[PDB]
Amino acid sequence: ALKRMRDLENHLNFHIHTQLEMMRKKQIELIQRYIEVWSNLEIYQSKGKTFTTSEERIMKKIYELFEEINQPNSIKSKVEEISNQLKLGSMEKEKIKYEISPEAVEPLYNLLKNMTISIERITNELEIAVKDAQILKNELYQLKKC
Amino acid sequence: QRIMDNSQKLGKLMDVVVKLNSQQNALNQCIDVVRDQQALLERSLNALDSKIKSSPKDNETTADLERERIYSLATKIDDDIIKVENKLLGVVNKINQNQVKDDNPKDLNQKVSKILNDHLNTLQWIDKSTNILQESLKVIESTSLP
Amino acid sequence: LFNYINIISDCQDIQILSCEILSSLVRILRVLESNFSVSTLFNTDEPFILMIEKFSKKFIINNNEFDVWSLQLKTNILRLLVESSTNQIYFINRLLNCENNDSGGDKKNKSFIIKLLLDRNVSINDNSEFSLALFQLVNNLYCNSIYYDSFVDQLNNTQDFWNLLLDMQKTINEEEEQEEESIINEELICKKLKITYAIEILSLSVLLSSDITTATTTVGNLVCSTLSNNKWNEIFKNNKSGIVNMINNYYFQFIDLENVFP
Amino acid sequence: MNVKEMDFNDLSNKSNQIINRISSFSSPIGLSSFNIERNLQEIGDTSKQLNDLTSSKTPFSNPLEPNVFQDSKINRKYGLDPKVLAKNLSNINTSSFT
Amino acid sequence: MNSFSNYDTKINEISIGLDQVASVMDNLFNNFDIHIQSFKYLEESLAKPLNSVNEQVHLLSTQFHSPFSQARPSKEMEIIVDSLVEKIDRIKQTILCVTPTNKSQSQNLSFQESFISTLQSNQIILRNLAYIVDNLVTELERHKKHFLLYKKKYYNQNYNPFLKQ
């Protein structure tokens, strides 16, 4: 029994996880191409026409969100600083190490353990609360539509 | 008695091995459904693309040139976002390795620091999820009923 | 200034002046490290950091461009490195590609200061500045804790660094029968400085040679076989008085000032 | 005695399983489900920032209004007995470390 | 009588074996269901693009010129640009969680005092968030009951969408 559970533990932790990351990547490969085909759709359905004030208001927003990514002080630039701070060891701070007294190990174990058991409950209830709230928000939106 | 106690314990665990076989069949069906939804979105994108890329380029206008220029800028934004996400994930996954470099499954400093970091990132998620719940409350409360 | 150093293959005064401007900026910053954070000033900018990576990949790898550069450019690039190797640890970490976070091509990179000690197209007499500044840069990196084992293992395993020391020990003993009167003083000070840094370095490499307490079955094979059991034994078995000569000549004859200055 | 061996393996296994569940309800795509391993000063700084922030999201009543029924609900619900918590904390002083 | 043997070692060893089979089994449900939720989010994430691409594939198959021309840009292009904003602000909020903060006031404390202050602060945050969650869940539990009473009054709907799995 102990062996068969370790056989299935290794199936979840390696085989199923390798299928999950491959499906996560194919989701990105389909989302980038959902945008490819919808930009190409909107050009095709707008072709041979003037703009609208809403096409201007959204084309301005497409330019605003291009520049914040591409300017000298951009999101790209600031990720490239951190890429280089990390390469340099600007974030590998020195690892001081201690004897925690054998008098304090039982107090510390039970303090951290009571925090884990409290966090466990708060996460169990808040996970449900966000689900019940979005279910109520979905139901109310269709009730405001009949 | 102690052999009969351990025998009932093994039996009641084997009755729950039948439930682990249930979770494996549920997990298998999620892996079937996500695969064949991805292979269906793929197939409908190819069935939309093929309609756009069979129209004439005859009578494009100056508005259609600026429009093809800006709706392709939106496609460039998603691909540049994904380059930044992969590079910043390539920073986080190194910072995590850098703190874990001293891996010693007999230390206490490594384990106490990780249990407190797992607590910290969980408490940051609990705050973020209370904000998402409270802002969802406002949108329930402003969704007045007839 | 690094564009002017990398691109201007031609008006070499501009490459020299750029190294001197950088050296004076480094000198000003080192007097103001109570206020200016020099690491952040070299963290932000990947155009600049790809320029240090262009300059390092040019200088570290390509000896064929190095012997197109004049000794005056080579010396003032070494002066910039001697200045920044005092306090500006992060700038040097980049300029050497000392950064880490089977395929072994990487071991070519961190070897370049050990090329500069051993690439005998260049001499260690024929200019005092270049050769003194190289021994100062090597001394600074050997005295700095963050570079220590990562530089000192590469020096210890390089048999020809120990051959350089066993050649400069001839330069002393083969000059000391041949030159009387005029000029000598400033090169004699530069020779005594090169020797002083080499003896500090020797003291530290001899300290580290033994504290790997676990390696009981392998150290006694390595130390007996990389160095030939001829070469190191022949010094101390021919010159059986060798430490008594080292004390009475190479220490005390250098110290006895009332002979050296009247 | 029997010791119930106070293993920080099983405590780390369960702090990490809470995160591995959280990162299945955060999006499994993009910068949504990552976590950062911080060192102990950064854990203290981020803890202070989250303490100073969350204390201004709790409408704590005037300290002369310590609502005994909410106190009795919340600390039983989540397990936050201050008499157990403060007793465990009071054995963790500076002379508990070398 | 003098050929009797003890066996309590073996009966302890089997108990401890069955305690390890239980611990591995509890972890096996957590690892099963973490994967099941991770694949549910991929099914739910596909469902929107899957629908909207499939409607434009159909409109462009009846050859139907809608006389009310679809408004320009289309509402899924509005949503695509806001989907770029939400990724952009996820990157901003990641940068601000990875950049090393300028030297905190905690450089005026020892490792020992800052560790005790971290245990105190985590215990205070845990109390603060426990109150915020207990309040927000109590009030979500008002709104859910108003909604069920509204559906039960005007629509006679005794169905409840908050029935758990």
PDB file of C-alpha atoms in Angstrom, chain B:
ATOM      1  CA  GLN B   1      -6.163  -6.571  19.875  1.00  0.00           C
ATOM      2  CA  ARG B   2      -3.227  -4.546  18.409  1.00  0.00           C
ATOM      3  CA  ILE B   3      -3.186  -6.814  15.278  1.00  0.00           C
ATOM      4  CA  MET B   4      -7.010  -6.334  14.901  1.00  0.00           C
ATOM      5  CA  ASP B   5      -6.646  -2.509  15.425  1.00  0.00           C
ATOM      6  CA  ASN B   6      -3.895  -2.314  12.728  1.00  0.00           C
ATOM      7  CA  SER B   7      -6.029  -4.639  10.480  1.00  0.00           C
ATOM      8  CA  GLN B   8      -9.082  -2.294  10.738  1.00  0.00           C
ATOM      9  CA  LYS B   9      -6.702   0.682  10.108  1.00  0.00           C
ATOM     10  CA  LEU B  10      -5.350  -0.968   6.897  1.00  0.00           C
ATOM     11  CA  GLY B  11      -8.930  -1.878   5.776  1.00  0.00           C
ATOM     12  CA  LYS B  12     -10.279   1.702   6.248  1.00  0.00           C
ATOM     13  CA  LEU B  13      -7.246   3.063   4.304  1.00  0.00           C
ATOM     14  CA  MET B  14      -7.924   0.532   1.453  1.00  0.00           C
ATOM     15  CA  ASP B  15     -11.590   1.745   1.295  1.00  0.00           C
ATOM     16  CA  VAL B  16     -10.067   5.257   0.703  1.00  0.00           C
ATOM     17  CA  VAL B  17      -7.699   3.902  -2.057  1.00  0.00           C
ATOM     18  CA  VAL B  18     -11.031   3.429  -3.959  1.00  0.00           C
ATOM     19  CA  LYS B  19     -11.513   7.258  -3.594  1.00  0.00           C
ATOM     20  CA  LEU B  20      -7.962   7.983  -4.941  1.00  0.00           C
ATOM     21  CA  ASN B  21      -8.948   5.922  -8.043  1.00  0.00           C
ATOM     22  CA  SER B  22     -12.013   8.279  -8.314  1.00  0.00           C
ATOM     23  CA  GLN B  23      -9.860  11.477  -8.220  1.00  0.00           C
ATOM     24  CA  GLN B  24      -7.594   9.984 -10.953  1.00  0.00           C
ATOM     25  CA  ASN B  25     -10.647   9.494 -13.266  1.00  0.00           C
ATOM     26  CA  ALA B  26     -11.871  13.075 -12.525  1.00  0.00           C
ATOM     27  CA  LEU B  27      -8.340  14.445 -13.265  1.00  0.00           C
ATOM     28  CA  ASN B  28      -8.147  12.339 -16.492  1.00  0.00           C
ATOM     29  CA  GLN B  29     -11.455  13.854 -17.744  1.00  0.00           C
ATOM     30  CA  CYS B  30     -10.200  17.439 -17.053  1.00  0.00           C
ATOM     31  CA  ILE B  31      -7.059  16.558 -19.145  1.00  0.00           C
ATOM     32  CA  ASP B  32      -9.339  15.217 -21.969  1.00  0.00           C
ATOM     33  CA  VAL B  33     -11.639  18.315 -21.904  1.00  0.00           C
ATOM     34  CA  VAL B  34      -8.825  20.968 -21.794  1.00  0.00           C
ATOM     35  CA  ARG B  35      -6.946  19.162 -24.653  1.00  0.00           C
ATOM     36  CA  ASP B  36     -10.014  18.983 -26.925  1.00  0.00           C
ATOM     37  CA  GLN B  37     -11.151  22.561 -26.086  1.00  0.00           C
ATOM     38  CA  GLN B  38      -7.592  23.746 -27.049  1.00  0.00           C
ATOM     39  CA  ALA B  39      -7.818  21.624 -30.262  1.00  0.00           C
ATOM     40  CA  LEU B  40     -11.305  23.224 -30.902  1.00  0.00           C
ATOM     41  CA  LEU B  41     -10.188  26.886 -30.334  1.00  0.00           C
ATOM     42  CA  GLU B  42      -7.180  26.109 -32.635  1.00  0.00           C
ATOM     43  CA  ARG B  43      -9.685  24.794 -35.245  1.00  0.00           C
ATOM     44  CA  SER B  44     -12.076  27.792 -35.026  1.00  0.00           C
ATOM     45  CA  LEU B  45      -9.128  30.277 -35.245  1.00  0.00           C
ATOM     46  CA  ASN B  46      -8.053  28.457 -38.470  1.00  0.00           C
ATOM     47  CA  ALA B  47     -11.751  28.740 -39.610  1.00  0.00           C
ATOM     48  CA  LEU B  48     -11.719  32.578 -39.014  1.00  0.00           C
ATOM     49  CA  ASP B  49      -8.162  33.327 -40.282  1.00  0.00           C
ATOM     50  CA  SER B  50      -8.945  31.529 -43.611  1.00  0.00           C
ATOM     51  CA  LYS B  51     -11.890  34.002 -44.203  1.00  0.00           C
ATOM     52  CA  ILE B  52      -9.834  37.160 -43.506  1.00  0.00           C
ATOM     53  CA  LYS B  53      -6.810  35.896 -45.549  1.00  0.00           C
ATOM     54  CA  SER B  54      -9.069  35.250 -48.602  1.00  0.00           C
ATOM     55  CA  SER B  55     -10.367  38.884 -48.931  1.00  0.00           C
ATOM     56  CA  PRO B  56      -8.898  41.241 -51.641  1.00  0.00           C
ATOM     57  CA  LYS B  57      -6.403  44.020 -50.667  1.00  0.00           C
ATOM     58  CA  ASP B  58      -8.068  46.069 -53.485  1.00  0.00           C
ATOM     59  CA  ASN B  59      -9.247  49.530 -52.185  1.00  0.00           C
ATOM     60  CA  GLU B  60      -7.378  49.956 -48.895  1.00  0.00           C
ATOM     61  CA  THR B  61      -7.430  53.628 -47.691  1.00  0.00           C
ATOM     62  CA  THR B  62      -5.172  55.905 -45.532  1.00  0.00           C
ATOM     63  CA  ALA B  63      -7.519  55.064 -42.609  1.00  0.00           C
ATOM     64  CA  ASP B  64      -7.021  51.300 -43.307  1.00  0.00           C
ATOM     65  CA  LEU B  65      -3.185  51.757 -43.382  1.00  0.00           C
ATOM     66  CA  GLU B  66      -3.138  53.553 -39.956  1.00  0.00           C
ATOM     67  CA  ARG B  67      -5.695  50.871 -38.786  1.00  0.00           C
ATOM     68  CA  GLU B  68      -3.494  47.908 -39.945  1.00  0.00           C
ATOM     69  CA  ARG B  69      -0.515  49.756 -38.293  1.00  0.00           C
ATOM     70  CA  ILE B  70      -2.326  50.203 -34.893  1.00  0.00           C
ATOM     71  CA  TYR B  71      -4.215  46.837 -34.625  1.00  0.00           C
ATOM     72  CA  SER B  72      -0.842  45.093 -35.337  1.00  0.00           C
ATOM     73  CA  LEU B  73       0.671  47.303 -32.546  1.00  0.00           C
ATOM     74  CA  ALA B  74      -1.828  45.600 -30.141  1.00  0.00           C
ATOM     75  CA  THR B  75      -0.490  42.157 -31.311  1.00  0.00           C
ATOM     76  CA  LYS B  76       3.107  43.442 -30.705  1.00  0.00           C
ATOM     77  CA  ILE B  77       2.103  44.556 -27.147  1.00  0.00           C
ATOM     78  CA  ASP B  78       0.988  40.993 -26.151  1.00  0.00           C
ATOM     79  CA  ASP B  79       4.192  39.395 -27.562  1.00  0.00           C
ATOM     80  CA  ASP B  80       6.381  42.053 -25.794  1.00  0.00           C
ATOM     81  CA  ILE B  81       4.363  41.539 -22.523  1.00  0.00           C
ATOM     82  CA  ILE B  82       5.001  37.750 -22.775  1.00  0.00           C
ATOM     83  CA  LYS B  83       8.787  38.383 -23.308  1.00  0.00           C
ATOM     84  CA  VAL B  84       8.768  40.553 -20.117  1.00  0.00           C
ATOM     85  CA  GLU B  85       6.708  37.947 -18.126  1.00  0.00           C
ATOM     86  CA  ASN B  86       9.155  35.142 -19.120  1.00  0.00           C
ATOM     87  CA  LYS B  87      12.200  37.346 -18.203  1.00  0.00           C
ATOM     88  CA  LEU B  88      10.747  38.541 -14.827  1.00  0.00           C
ATOM     89  CA  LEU B  89       9.728  34.911 -14.012  1.00  0.00           C
ATOM     90  CA  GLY B  90      13.394  34.126 -14.957  1.00  0.00           C
ATOM     91  CA  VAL B  91      14.349  36.646 -12.174  1.00  0.00           C
ATOM     92  CA  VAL B  92      11.909  35.300  -9.475  1.00  0.00           C
ATOM     93  CA  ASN B  93      12.881  31.628 -10.080  1.00  0.00           C
ATOM     94  CA  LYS B  94      16.584  32.633  -9.570  1.00  0.00           C
ATOM     95  CA  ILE B  95      15.914  34.698  -6.362  1.00  0.00           C
ATOM     96  CA  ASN B  96      14.092  31.608  -4.991  1.00  0.00           C
ATOM     97  CA  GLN B  97      17.084  29.343  -5.886  1.00  0.00           C
ATOM     98  CA  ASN B  98      19.525  31.943  -4.397  1.00  0.00           C
ATOM     99  CA  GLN B  99      17.870  31.825  -0.924  1.00  0.00           C
ATOM    100  CA  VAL B 100      17.586  27.953  -1.153  1.00  0.00           C
ATOM    101  CA  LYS B 101      21.344  27.466  -2.211  1.00  0.00           C
ATOM    102  CA  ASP B 102      22.257  26.171   1.329  1.00  0.00           C
ATOM    103  CA  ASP B 103      19.851  23.148   1.099  1.00  0.00           C
ATOM    104  CA  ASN B 104      20.232  21.175   4.343  1.00  0.00           C
ATOM    105  CA  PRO B 105      17.234  18.974   5.438  1.00  0.00           C
ATOM    106  CA  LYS B 106      18.774  18.959   9.014  1.00  0.00           C
ATOM    107  CA  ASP B 107      18.974  22.768   9.469  1.00  0.00           C
ATOM    108  CA  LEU B 108      16.341  24.697  11.452  1.00  0.00           C
ATOM    109  CA  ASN B 109      17.155  28.227  10.091  1.00  0.00           C
ATOM    110  CA  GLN B 110      16.269  27.198   6.467  1.00  0.00           C
ATOM    111  CA  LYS B 111      12.935  25.634   7.608  1.00  0.00           C
ATOM    112  CA  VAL B 112      11.858  28.420  10.041  1.00  0.00           C
ATOM    113  CA  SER B 113      12.659  31.065   7.360  1.00  0.00           C
ATOM    114  CA  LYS B 114      10.641  29.099   4.724  1.00  0.00           C
ATOM    115  CA  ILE B 115       7.618  28.475   7.052  1.00  0.00           C
ATOM    116  CA  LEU B 116       7.576  32.262   7.797  1.00  0.00           C
ATOM    117  CA  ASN B 117       7.944  33.120   4.057  1.00  0.00           C
ATOM    118  CA  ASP B 118       5.084  30.683   3.206  1.00  0.00           C
ATOM    119  CA  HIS B 119       3.058  32.394   5.997  1.00  0.00           C
ATOM    120  CA  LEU B 120       4.012  35.870   4.627  1.00  0.00           C
ATOM    121  CA  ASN B 121       3.098  35.231   0.936  1.00  0.00           C
ATOM    122  CA  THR B 122      -0.145  33.540   2.167  1.00  0.00           C
ATOM    123  CA  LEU B 123      -1.022  36.580   4.393  1.00  0.00           C
ATOM    124  CA  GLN B 124      -0.327  38.858   1.345  1.00  0.00           C
ATOM    125  CA  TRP B 125      -2.730  36.637  -0.710  1.00  0.00           C
ATOM    126  CA  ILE B 126      -5.381  36.743   2.102  1.00  0.00           C
ATOM    127  CA  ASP B 127      -5.196  40.607   2.090  1.00  0.00           C
ATOM    128  CA  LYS B 128      -5.400  40.690  -1.763  1.00  0.00           C
ATOM    129  CA  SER B 129      -8.395  38.270  -1.711  1.00  0.00           C
ATOM    130  CA  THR B 130     -10.184  40.364   1.002  1.00  0.00           C
ATOM    131  CA  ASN B 131      -9.730  43.438  -1.273  1.00  0.00           C
ATOM    132  CA  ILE B 132     -11.176  41.453  -4.269  1.00  0.00           C
ATOM    133  CA  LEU B 133     -14.087  40.260  -2.036  1.00  0.00           C
ATOM    134  CA  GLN B 134     -14.828  43.818  -0.714  1.00  0.00           C
ATOM    135  CA  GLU B 135     -14.693  45.384  -4.236  1.00  0.00           C
ATOM    136  CA  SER B 136     -17.006  42.540  -5.391  1.00  0.00           C
ATOM    137  CA  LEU B 137     -19.353  43.465  -2.468  1.00  0.00           C
ATOM    138  CA  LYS B 138     -19.640  47.112  -3.775  1.00  0.00           C
ATOM    139  CA  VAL B 139     -20.636  45.743  -7.238  1.00  0.00           C
ATOM    140  CA  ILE B 140     -23.267  43.398  -5.671  1.00  0.00           C
ATOM    141  CA  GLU B 141     -24.594  46.338  -3.538  1.00  0.00           C
ATOM    142  CA  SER B 142     -24.793  48.763  -6.528  1.00  0.00           C
ATOM    143  CA  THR B 143     -26.584  45.971  -8.528  1.00  0.00           C
ATOM    144  CA  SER B 144     -30.020  47.137  -7.299  1.00  0.00           C
ATOM    145  CA  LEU B 145     -33.043  44.839  -7.927  1.00  0.00           C
ATOM    146  CA  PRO B 146     -36.519  45.503  -9.558  1.00  0.00           C
TER     147      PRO B 146
END
